[PDB]
């Protein structure tokens, strides 16, 4: 089972640099080209560069010479991409991929991708979120089924992790993408259950904000 695991989200100060890692397993690392791709604001892909771990040979897209430097450690089967002197345009999601084109066969083998590493270039301060439970009053939807909510506000930077009943309750859940306003993000999630379940058995919102080591549980009381 071929896998590529990338490092976590990075908050970088303007003018500084970061080193992203792409750890592989399941195939011979030295025999295939690893490519890095950039993704800005949803749909908008750009090819950065490629490296062949076996020899250290690299090819760069002109736009990124001096911006990106690719390396590969054969002993740990890890590919790295260093980004230097970060600015506005560098905030994006970066993917590494064992693309699969075999130059000698003029054909392809399956492509495998990492999960992506989000880089945020900002000088705004890290802020822990406030988690607020949302119990119905008119958001009861009458009998049959009732929807509860959880409001996570005033945090920076992304991401935040929100689960219900520690992952147990996953159906009838809608988690909305965070929206930035005044240097702080706001996120919310709703869960729809039947009148028989709540309030009878408890529903709890779990929130984690790694950047600030915040982990908080909020039970939705009537």
């Amino acid at each position: 089972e071929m896998q590529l695991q990338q490092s976590g989200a990075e908050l970088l100060r303007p003018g500084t640099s970061v080193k992203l890692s792409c750890k592989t397993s399941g195939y011979i690392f030295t025999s295939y080209w690893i490519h890095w791709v950039k993704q800005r604001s949803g749909q908008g892909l750009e090819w950065i560069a490629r490296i062949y771990p076996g020899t250290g040979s690299t090819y760069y897209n002109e736009k990124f010479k001096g911006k990106a430097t690719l390396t590969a450690d054969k002993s740990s089967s890890t590919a790295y991409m260093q980004l230097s002197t970060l600015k506005s345009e560098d905030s994006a999601v970066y993917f590494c991929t064992r693309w699969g084109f075999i130059p000698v066969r003029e054909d392809y083998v399956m492509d495998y991708w990492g999960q992506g590493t989000l880089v945020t270039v900002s000088s705004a301060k890290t802020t822990a979120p406030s988690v607020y439970p949302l119990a119905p009053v008119c958001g009861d939807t009458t009998g049959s089924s009732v929807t509860l909510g959880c409001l996570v506000k005033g945090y920076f930077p992304e991401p935040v992790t929100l689960t219900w009943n520690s992952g147990s309750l996953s159906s009838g859940v809608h988690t909305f993408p965070a929206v930035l306003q005044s240097d702080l993000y706001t996120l919310s999630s709703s869960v729809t259950v039947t009148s028989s379940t709540w309030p009878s058995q408890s529903i709890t919102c779990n929130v984690a904000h790694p950047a600030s080591s915040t982990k908080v549980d909020k039970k939705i009381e009537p």
């Binding site: 749909q43 949302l134 809608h174 993408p177």
Partner: protein, 219 residues
């Protein structure tokens, strides 16, 4: 660099119908060895991109043959014979014939389903938040279709445009509907000065506005 132009930007198709996406290049993609390096990738919501097709028409391993690709020179087409729910996502054509490799801007495929009315829930500020001096009123408008919807907040009859924060989910791969959250934030002081809080929505499924509200008082 080679410019790749995809059309349409978005396409709405019902399950069982065919779909086709077009990709045009500013230079011929015929490489000097006679091969045409044009690939098609699919990026499903929240997932990494995946190659569907290589060399214009060759399907990658594990890709359903309901998907086909054709074209030559500067014009290429991806066709899906019968759309299924799992085809939801953004499709991209990417050329590798000319250095550097370049991508098309993407085509979002959305599954057209029957009109669905939003289920609306409204929530007053929690005690916790009020204690801190803030007050957010939240309105969830769940499982509706089409995505086109307009929400307005009204406090005691007059529209409130400031302090509103909206967010939409992408199309759900289970029922093909959309959901949206709308949060109005005020100070605790101002919250306690008004009575009625209304979340009002305009949607194709109703000739009159869809309303949800509450009156804050005491007891």
């Amino acid at each position: 660099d080679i410019v790749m132009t995809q059309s349409p930007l978005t396409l709405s198709v019902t399950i069982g119908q065919p779909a086709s996406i077009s990709c045009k290049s500013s230079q011929s993609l015929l490489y000097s060895n006679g091969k045409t390096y044009l690939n098609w990738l699919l990026q499903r919501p929240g997932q990494s991109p995946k190659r569907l097709i290589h060399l214009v028409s060759k399907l990658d391993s594990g890709v359903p043959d309901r998907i086909t690709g054709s074209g030559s020179g500067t014009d290429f087409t991806l066709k899906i014979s019968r759309v299924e729910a799992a085809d939801l996502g953004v499709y991209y054509c990417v050329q590798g014939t000319h250095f550097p490799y370049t991508f098309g801007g993407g085509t979002k495929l959305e599954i057209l389903r029957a009109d669905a009315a939003p289920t609306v829930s409204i929530f007053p500020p929690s005690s916790e938040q009020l204690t801190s001096g803030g007050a957010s009123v939240v309105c969830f408008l769940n499982n509706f279709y089409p995505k086109d919807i307009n929400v307005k907040w009204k406090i005691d009859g007059s529209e409130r445009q400031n302090g509103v924060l909206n967010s939409w989910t992408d199309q759900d791969s289970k029922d093909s509907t959309y959901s949206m959250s709308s949060t109005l934030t005020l100070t605790k002081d101002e919250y306690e000065r008004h009575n009625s809080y209304t979340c009002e929505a305009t949607h194709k499924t109703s000739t009159s506005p869809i309303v949800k509200s509450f009156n804050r008082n005491e007891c």
